[PDB]
């Protein structure tokens, strides 16, 4: 909805009332393997709900789809009404923000990504460049030894006033088919594209849940993604309203 005492919050929340179309474009290069991914779907910030179908437009994806879940739109996260003054992602809109990441896979290579997330008219667009180096050929990544699922996880978000944005470091535990886990340490920084003011948040975390599925009628290498992202970690406003 729109009814917020803060006009800055009302500016951001209004852009994400209801369902918004999403376009995702990634151009990636992992160990010389060049690939491109196009994703389409819709986000519902009211419920923190994402529905996206990604298509590898260059053939077979040289990396497992779970390794690209976080790389392949945080502005659709559901921030509770008492935490909406900490929604950096919606405040940077419609100009958008740059999302840069370095993803270290334990005992394997690393991803280096840079994305520009912004509105193209009514459509929320995520344009991504990916560069992967030093990956082991027979490893869990290029060997496609990971399971096709995603574990739920909480990730803390912290402000970065020197860059007028946010920063985040967190661990992703991919499930290997033999029962083990492939650690993927994420380092993230976000900076607004426009020079206007943004909402610098307090330290809070995002609860994330993802379901991976397949379109039975799709013959191209693809991934169907249902993702829920809800912010938490800030108790009400003053004290408590019930105890």
Swiss-Prot record:
Changing residue 172 to V: In P9; increases fluorescence at 475 nm excitation. In R10-3; matures to the red-emitting state with excitation and emission maxima at 555 and 585 nm, respectively. Contains a chromophore consisting of modified amino acid residues. Maturation of the chromophore requires nothing other than molecular oxygen. InterPro entries: GFP (IPR009017), GFP-related (IPR011584), Green_fluorescent_prot (IPR000786). It holds the Pfam family GFP. The gene is GFP. SUPFAM superfamilies: GFP-like. Changing residue 167 to Q: In R10-3; matures to the red-emitting state with excitation and emission maxima at 555 and 585 nm, respectively. Changing residue 150 to C: In mut1.9; shifts fluorescence lifetime from 3.03 to 2.74 ns. Changing residue 180 to G: In GFPA; leads to enhanced fluorescence at 37 degrees Celsius. In Venus; leads to yellow fluorescence, improved maturation and reduced environmental sensitivity. This is Green fluorescent protein. Changing residue 155 to I: In Azurite; shifts the excitation and emission spectra to shorter wavelengths and increases quantum yields compared to BFP. Monomer. Changing residue 150 to A: In Cerulean; leads to improved quantum yield, a higher extinction coefficient and is 2.5-fold brighter than ECFP. Energy-transfer acceptor. Its role is to transduce the blue chemiluminescence of the protein aequorin into green fluorescent light by energy transfer. Fluoresces in vivo upon receiving energy from the Ca(2+)-activated photoprotein aequorin. Changing residue 133 to V: In EBFP2.0; shifts the excitation and emission spectra to shorter wavelengths and increases quantum yields compared to BFP. Keywords: Chromophore, Luminescence, Photoprotein. Changing residue 208 to Y: Gives rise to yellow-emission variants. In EYFP; leads to yellow fluorescence, folds faster and more efficiently at 37 degrees Celsius and has superior solubility and brightness. Changing residue 85 to R: In Azurite; shifts the excitation and emission spectra to shorter wavelengths and increases quantum yields compared to BFP. Green fluorescent protein has been engineered to produce a vast number of variously colored mutants, fusion proteins, and biosensors. Further generation of mutants led to more stable proteins (at 37 degrees Celsius for example) with brighter fluorescence and longer fluorescence lifetimes.
